[PDB]
Amino acid sequence: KDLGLPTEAYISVEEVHDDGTPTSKTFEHVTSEIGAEEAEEVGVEHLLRDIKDTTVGTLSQRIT
Amino acid sequence: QYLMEGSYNKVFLAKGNIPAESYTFFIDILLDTIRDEIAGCIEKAYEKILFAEATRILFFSTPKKMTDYAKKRGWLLGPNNYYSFASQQQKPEDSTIPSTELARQVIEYARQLEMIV
Amino acid sequence: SFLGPEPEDLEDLYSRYKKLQQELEFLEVQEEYIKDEQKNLKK
């Protein structure tokens, strides 16, 4: 939905919203991160040799 | 050599009348030129000085003479003049707030550096 | 001074050069590939 993760995390919230409108039930988003446990890390690291967000190996890697 | 040096007092025009082999008709239009040069140098010279101090060195002493060359300089009116234009130009080195141009060659240095590594 | 084999010089353009050009184009491809690969070993 952006360019990073395809995941959003939500919690149901009730909040008063005013412009001529009553109190609304909505879903308020909370930000997400990435992270894994050792088993997962092992397979992805050997398999990866792709270009990524950045690998890091040169100055030029950093511009991407 | 004298004009280049910055002298407007040992310049000579008397030595151009020693030949009268039609060098005698060039002096006519080289009493203009000496005047022109003093006047430009004075624009650079003063951040701002009094009218009185500057006219005796121009060798103008009538307001008509002041007006005539003042047009060329960009100076406004006759005894009144703005010598200040030229001085004003030096001062902008002070800025720092807009970085892109002020730093300079930001694109250039980066590009070559990236190739090398 | 002047070049020794003028029949070889006139003939060579059509002969050796034309044929070679294809072989060279592969050689160009191998040059870009090495760079990509070189950068890939670095990852």
Mapping DSSP to helix (H, G, I), strand (E, B) and coil, where does residue A25 land?
strand
Tokens of B23: 């060098």
Angle between helices B63-73 and B33-45 (to 10 degrees): 70
Instruction: Tokens 């002070």: give the residue.
Output: B94
Instruction: Tokens 């191998």: give the residue.
Output: C30
**Residues of chain C contacting A55 with CB distance shorter than 8 Å:** 43
Euclidean distance between CA atoms B18 and B9, whole angstroms: 19
Contact A41, C25 (CB under 8 A): no
Tokens of A52: 């990524």
Mapping DSSP to helix (H, G, I), strand (E, B) and coil, where does residue C38 land?
helix
DSSP alpha helices (H): ranges in chain B?
2-5, 33-45, 51-58, 63-73, 85-88, 99-103, 106-116
Tokens of C40: 């890939």
**Residues of chain A contacting B117 with CB distance shorter than 8 Å:** 58-60
CA distance A3 to chain C (A): 22
CA dihedral defined by B43, B49, B52, B54, rounded to 10 degrees?
Answer: -30
Euclidean distance between CA atoms B12 and B114, whole angstroms: 62
Contact B79, B55 (CB under 8 A): yes
For chain B, give the number of residues. 117
Long-range CB pairs of B55-63, under 8 A, 24+ apart, other chains included: B55/B79, B59/B35
Euclidean distance between CA atoms A35 and A51, whole angstroms: 19
CA distance B102 to chain A (A): 22
Euclidean distance between CA atoms A14 and B21, whole angstroms: 105
Euclidean distance between CA atoms B28 and B26, whole angstroms: 5
Euclidean distance between CA atoms C18 and C22, whole angstroms: 8
Q: What is the DSSP letter of B19?
A: -
Q: What residues are paired with A14 via a beta bridge?
A: A25
Tokens of B83: 């010598």
Quick check: A63 contacting B, CB < 8 Å? yes
Assign residue B104 a region: left if phi > 0, alpha if psi is -120 to 50, beta otherwise? left
* DSSP letters spanning C4-24: S-HHHHHHHIIIIIHHHHHHH
**Residues of chain C contacting A53 with CB distance shorter than 8 Å:** none
Euclidean distance between CA atoms A16 and A22, whole angstroms: 7
Q: How many Cα atoms within 13 Å fall on the side-chain side of residue B72?
A: 12
The coordinates were experimentally obtained by cryo-EM
CB contact under 8 A, B113 and A58: no
Cα–chain-centroid distance for residue B106? Answer: 34
